[PDB]
């Protein structure tokens, strides 16, 4: 069962370069093509180019030709996309995608067609601003966040830059009833979001609840234990 696993989120200054990796696990590139497709905010997906690893042959869209290099190491079943001379407008989620090829007899070449397996994506933010970690505040459960046998609790994930964060609960053991809201950009230039979960209110006395936040761009992970309110 084939899976493509990309490198983590990146924050980069204008003018710099980024290299994003894409590793085929439980798998190999075989005679498939690996493309890179991005999606920038407010824009459609854009095919940047691709490579057929068995041949070593890469093609690029005109828009990026001269600034993008796609390579593949068959020994490691890992592909790469290097994008140089970065601009603000390069801020996007970058996907690797595998797909087949068809042979065009009229032009005497293999051609890229469609993408049957996509990687999880890599958010690359191009900014002159520096990365900064989130500060976690509890959304503590109380009489004002309960209804019948249910209680709501959460974490406010405040003042980080750039996106993304990953939020888990109890190291991924708690997934039912979790809503992690989309981040909002603050007038400070920093992002904020909350993650909430509903749980049985009877468990507030006995079960520990910790939100785990990973913020790769600032190389920070934060865990916060969320306790119920008391009149103490």
């Amino acid at each position: 069962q084939v899976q493509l696993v990309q490198s983590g989120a990146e924050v980069k200054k204008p003018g710099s370069s980024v290299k994003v990796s894409c590793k085929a696990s439980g798998g190999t590139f075989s005679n498939y093509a690996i493309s890179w497709v991005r999606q920038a905010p407010g824009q459609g997906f854009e095919w940047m180019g691709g490579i057929i690893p068995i041949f070593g042959t890469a093609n690029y869209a005109q828009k990026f030709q001269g600034r993008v290099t796609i390579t593949a190491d068959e020994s490691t079943s890992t592909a790469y996309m290097e994008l140089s001379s970065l601009r603000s407008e390069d801020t996007a989620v970058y996907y690797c995608a595998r797909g087949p090829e068809y042979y065009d007899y009229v032009w005497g070449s293999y051609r890229y067609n469609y993408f049957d397996y996509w990687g999880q994506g890599t958010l690359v933010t191009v900014s002159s601003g520096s990365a900064s970690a989130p500060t976690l505040f509890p959304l503590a459960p109380s009489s004002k966040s309960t209804s019948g046998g249910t209680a709501a609790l959460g974490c406010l994930v405040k003042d980080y830059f750039p996106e993304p964060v990953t939020v888990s609960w109890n190291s991924g053991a708690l997934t039912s009833g979790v809503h992690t809201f989309p981040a909002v950009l603050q007038s400070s230039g920093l992002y904020s979001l909350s993650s909430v979960v509903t749980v049985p209110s009877s468990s507030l006395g006995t079960q520990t609840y910790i939100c785990n936040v990973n913020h790769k761009p600032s190389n920070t992970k934060v865990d916060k234990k969320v306790e119920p309110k008391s009149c103490d």
């Binding site: 109380s142 209804s147 959460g154 981040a183 979001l193 008391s230």
Partner: protein, 220 residues
């Protein structure tokens, strides 16, 4: 480049009914050598990478359910989703591969229709930890409602707040076809400490009259 235009840009369809999504190319994407339309459809569910549904305009990818079908030729194509299921909430994209470079449609967002569901409304005071820093964030949570339209108003000492709250809404959940919403009121510590009663008032089609959640600063 070939331009791919989808229609409509969004739609809302009832479960068990048919959804139709169109895709037009600015020039033919019919490849003469095998007389296939070089046209593919992807589904991108919330929180996930795209998934291949259909290629050659009408051929389902192995394992894609029967209820997904693709039709059309030349410049006009359609994805039909029959007997719609909750797990079909997604943005749907078409893509051509007849002409270099590969290009994509702008997407069509499919929402699922359902019966009205009132939100559960919860409120969270700011943490003492946060206040010590100079800011107070007060959070009002509207959980699992439908349709997405609601009114959410903050009152501080009974005074309607404007310009100091931010709302964020989740994508529609496949498990129950609902939305949730967080409203965060941000005040300075000084302003937070000048007032006592903090209230989130919610109006929604599922509620016979508005629901208020409130607390009094400093009181448990």
């Amino acid at each position: 480049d070939i331009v791919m235009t989808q229609s409509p840009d969004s739609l809302a369809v009832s479960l068990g009914e048919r959804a139709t999504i169109n895709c037009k190319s600015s020039q033919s994407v019919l490849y003469s050598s095998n007389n296939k339309n070089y046209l593919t459809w992807y589904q991108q569910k919330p929180g996930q990478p795209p998934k291949l549904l259909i290629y050659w305009a009408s051929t389902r990818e192995s394992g894609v359910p029967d209820r997904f079908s693709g039709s059309g030729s030349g410049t006009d194509f359609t994805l039909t989703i029959s007997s719609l299921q909750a797990e079909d909430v997604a943005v749907y994209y078409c893509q051509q591969y007849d002409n270099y470079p590969i290009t994509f449609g702008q997407g069509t967002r499919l929402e699922i229709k359902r019966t009205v569901a009132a939100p559960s409304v919860f409120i969270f005071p700011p943490s003492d930890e946060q206040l010590k820093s100079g800011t107070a964030s007060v959070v009002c949570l509207l959980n699992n409602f439908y349709p997405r339209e609601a009114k959410v108003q903050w009152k501080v000492d009974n005074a309607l707040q404007s310009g100091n709250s931010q709302e964020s809404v989740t994508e529609q959940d496949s498990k129950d076809s609902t939305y949730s919403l967080s409203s965060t009121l941000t005040l300075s510590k000084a302003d937070y400490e000048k007032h006592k009663v903090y209230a989130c008032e919610v109006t929604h089609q599922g509620l016979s009259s508005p629901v208020t959640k409130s607390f009094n600063r400093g009181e448990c």
